[PDB]
Design a protein around this ligand. Structure first.
Ligand SMILES: Oc1ccccc1-c1nc(N[C@H]2CCNC2)c2ccccc2n1
Ligand SMILES: Oc1ccccc1-c1nc(N[C@H]2CCNC2)c2ccccc2n1
Lengths: 265, 265
């Protein structure tokens, strides 16, 4: 069941919510088409950054279709499941780019709110490539406490003034996890074995640690992840602050990357 | 500058944001027309309760016009400024109705978020009448923590689970103030004389008390207001709970009211 307007310009096919693959009926080049719903469309349209999915065209009605230049690399997930881990360089380079996107989002008062390896797509199958992020279905645009101010009011709201603004830290948190994962290979906060509620586990920040593997990582890498998973959003590394962190001061990361951009032209 | 479609069916005139008065160009009967903007229109359309403004017709474009059956009584504010206070009966009857509206709103997962004497309109000039509430421009429709559950996540969000739901208590709080006012004649939390930040004043709940006037109120009335201005939204009287409170168990209040409805037919 395909709308007439759609099948006219493309050849919708397999499956990669879940998104489907199609061929540009004019160039024979392949692309992927996506399948509070206006939000993502409105945002994905505002999205204009290398490490972020870029839209090529849009078509609504029936069901929702957003075609974007396809990422061959697939999901970052696929590359780091079955506890397969990844090389420091891979991580640094990968994560580095994530940091750029997450930063560019926050800079535009945008929150992803759902950052995970799945939503981190790669350029080409190779272990070295560029990475973008998709699925902006949960995002939010942040502009309200101004109404509360200059005026009465209820207590809980007033106190809320001391928290407003740090609604973006959640992305840093998830980025920390995503990083932790790539570097280690295992979930920081896993309901595996251990015990104790996940809420009590994640809220405490006492991530499950296993040196038997964390002994191979860098001396600066772990210290970063550690400073990234802070239970206090106020003391949690800002997307900006992270980029300045030592483990991200790597000419290699910015040399195998600053050129991989020209590999697009 | 009036749109052609508008002046066709009504005679827009004086001023009562601020709302203007107009005459039904078919019946010679008077009505008031109102002047995140779709929200109020969408909600005011869902509004179907005695103690709540009822819409008669809607017209958009240019500037925003929502015509509702006019309240002659005007603002509850007007009746209780200059520290003029009000009789216990007036309050009980008045506030009682407020409690009904605020309840009916919450029952429909609706929050007013801006309850003050101004936004409490009256039926007729008399000291005894029905009262509705308007200005739903700040309201909200409450459905999100379900997304957080059944799934990772950041700490602050998880803890947020222990607060979600009580976003409506703010209306009870303001109702308590509105009540306090009517009963006493003076603001519970006033930056007048005293000192100490309003945030530190309202957040503490230590309302400015003056017995030199609070000695005339009922023995149950004050106890209600007191139990209504609680710094903890979890222990703050629910709109439902309030109606059960002793000071609202008054056959008179429900006799001068249950009949004032038939005074509309
Ligand atoms: O190639 C693209 C070009 C632009 C935008 C997206 C993609 C994309 N997207 C996927 N899917 C989702 C499912 C939920 N989170 C990840 C995906 C999943 C598997 C393999 C390739 C994929 N390629
Ligand atoms: O008569 C009505 C019928 C339906 C809906 C509203 C009204 C209404 N509304 C007012 N105004 C606002 C300004 C901000 N909060 C209160 C108002 C203000 C003064 C006098 C009469 C008024 N009558």
């Amino acid at each position: 069941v395909y709308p007439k307007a759609l099948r006219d310009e493309y050849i919708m096919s397999k499956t990669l919510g879940e998104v489907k693959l199609a061929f540009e009926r004019k160039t024979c080049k392949k692309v992927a088409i996506k399948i509070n719903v206006e939000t993502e469309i409105e945002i994905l349209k505002k999205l204009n950054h290398p490490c972020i999915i870029k839209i090529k065209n849009f078509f609504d009605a029936e069901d929702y279709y957003i075609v974007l230049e396809l990422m061959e690399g697939g999901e970052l997930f696929d590359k780091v499941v079955g506890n397969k881990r990844l090389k420091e360089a891979t991580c640094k380079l990968y994560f580095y780019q994530m940091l750029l996107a997450v930063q560019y989002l926050h800079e535009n008062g945008i929150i992803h709110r759902d950052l995970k390896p799945e939503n981190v797509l790669l350029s080409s199958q190779e272990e070295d490539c560029l990475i973008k992020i998709t699925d902006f279905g949960h995002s939010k645009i942040l502009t309200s406490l101004m109404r509360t101010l200059c005026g009465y009011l209820a207590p809980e709201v007033l106190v809320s003034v001391g928290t407003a603004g740090y609604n973006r830290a959640v992305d840093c948190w998830s980025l920390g996890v995503i990083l932790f994962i790539c570097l280690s290979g295992y979930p920081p906060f896993s309901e595996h074995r251990t015990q104790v509620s996940l809420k009590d586990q994640i809220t405490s920040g006492k991530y499950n640690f296993i040196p038997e593997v964390w002994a191979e990582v860098s001396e600066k890498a772990l210290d970063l992840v550690k400073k990234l998973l802070v239970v206090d959003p106020k003391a949690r590394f800002t997307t900006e602050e992270a980029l300045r962190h030592p483990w991200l001061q790597d000419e290699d990361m910015k040399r195998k990357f600053q050129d991989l951009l020209s590999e697009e032209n």
